[PDB]
Amino acid sequence: GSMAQEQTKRGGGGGDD
Amino acid sequence: PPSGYGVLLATHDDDTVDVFTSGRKMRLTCSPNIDAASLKKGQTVRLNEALTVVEAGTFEAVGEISTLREILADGHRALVVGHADEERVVWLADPLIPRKLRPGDSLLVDTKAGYAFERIPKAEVEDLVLEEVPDVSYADIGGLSRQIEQIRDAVELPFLHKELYREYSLRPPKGVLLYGPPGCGKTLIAKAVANSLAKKMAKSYFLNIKGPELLNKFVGETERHIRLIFQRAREKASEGTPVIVFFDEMDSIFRTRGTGVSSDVETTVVPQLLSEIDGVEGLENVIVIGASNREDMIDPAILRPGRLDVKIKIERPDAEAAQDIYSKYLTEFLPVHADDLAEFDGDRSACIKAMIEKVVDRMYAEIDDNRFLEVTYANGDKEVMYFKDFNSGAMIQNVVDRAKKNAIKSVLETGQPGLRIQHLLDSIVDEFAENEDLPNTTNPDDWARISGKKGERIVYIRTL
Amino acid sequence: IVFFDEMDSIFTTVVPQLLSEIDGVEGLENVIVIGASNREDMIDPAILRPGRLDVKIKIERPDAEAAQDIYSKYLTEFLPVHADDLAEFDGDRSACIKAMIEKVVDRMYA
């Protein structure tokens, strides 16, 4: 019976031009 | 003969235009055939080898799609977010400037040109907020004629002759609160009035949201869900068509903001709804209908006049209302016993009416054959509460279903295609053989209310 | 077929949500909801109210014969059999298997 707060974890992403 | 294409940017007083083509912006002159006044921003223009605009068509239908973040105060630009959270301040085409664009809308854009062409509808946002078509009518509800009249007066009349209200400067009601014992038909009235309003217009939209569905594990999600629901309602009502928002089982969520539950998040959910109804921003054509069998548990701030001002108390059906419900759930087309048909000489309507009258007479009786509960009050007086004080509509439905099941058993055992009155008579007493949730623990709140009506506090409950 | 197992652990609570979902799925008569629970007393009678879950079926165990039937299902005729035990049944594999199943069931229920 309690609430939570989220911390994100960024995922790798890369593009060319 | 070959001719290219470009994106128009703006117009000039020198009868010159800006065209984006091949990733570069150029200054061009319109051909004498076309008129420079008719040109619009973002419109595709046909070019030539001499770099002269000769014809302008429609807008491009392909490209990237981005989420709208905000509209700049200048009224000609919009900040949007790309797929990888890249933020772009792009021009708005003529069609963009129905309702005005809101944050979260999807726009068809091309980054190199930097224009937003068309608002692309999304199916996910439509599916998130359900809008079903109610089918229950006023005919399906019986024994609540005065309540139907009240809800017609509070909903139907303000939109029937709204010009008369404007002449009288009367504000249409903003909130209706249905309350009463459980199983008395709270949802049916809302569905019926929604269907009637939908048929009355000659267009409306109805939003139904349940109680527990507005609860999330995290914090800050129920409030934004409510905000999105009310934003959708405002978007639908901005055209002027009335919009009905129905909250189901308000007892569970946004209870009393005081003590209430010793451990609940309610203290941060009720005010938001309040701010959505009464605030600096006031909704115009939105009607909020709430239904709760526990009116005392609802937040008094919500029940303040002006928000949910209209208050309707449904009461348990009496003998006449029970007869009306039985007539609603027993039609002429229903098979009947051959003996009864012969007795009535083919008058099927008279047969079913007489059977209904017999059933309702059996249900309402002070004989000790229909004993339900024993109640001892504070004074110590023992009273036998029979079925007459607990005849809910859902109970009548269960009685009819059990009688029909008994009829199926009889026809599969014997073979004669008919329904006996004795089937319903036996189903009346077999209804309470299985619990219908009417009995409860030592001191229920419903029985406390009944005692307050009686004047002596109920202390003892005994099954009979 | 939607099957729920070990429903005696559970049942203001999740019961109204389950009832609402059952009422919503009632329109789909092809879908069959089957619930299992070893403690009928602990199950809230609200789900047992007439309407949705009207049919209740009581099951038990193994009437000894079922255990034999179960042994026949498991210890089929294709399993290897000792020659000494075959000597008691003149090489009839099916009869030997049946007698062995009867013997083991009788000893187990002794």
Ligand SMILES: Nc1ncnc2c1ncn2[C@@H]1O[C@H](COP(=O)(O)OP(=O)(O)OP(=O)(O)O)[C@@H](O)[C@H]1O
């Ligand atoms: N005139 C009537 N009065 C009361 N009940 C009726 C009437 N006509 C039909 N019913 C039956 O009552 C049942 C309940 O209707 P409704 O959904 O409006 O109330 P409810 O929300 O189920 O009540 P509760 O708040 O106890 O859940 C329906 O299944 C319907 O078959």
Ligand SMILES: [Mg+2]
């Ligand atoms: Mg309801």
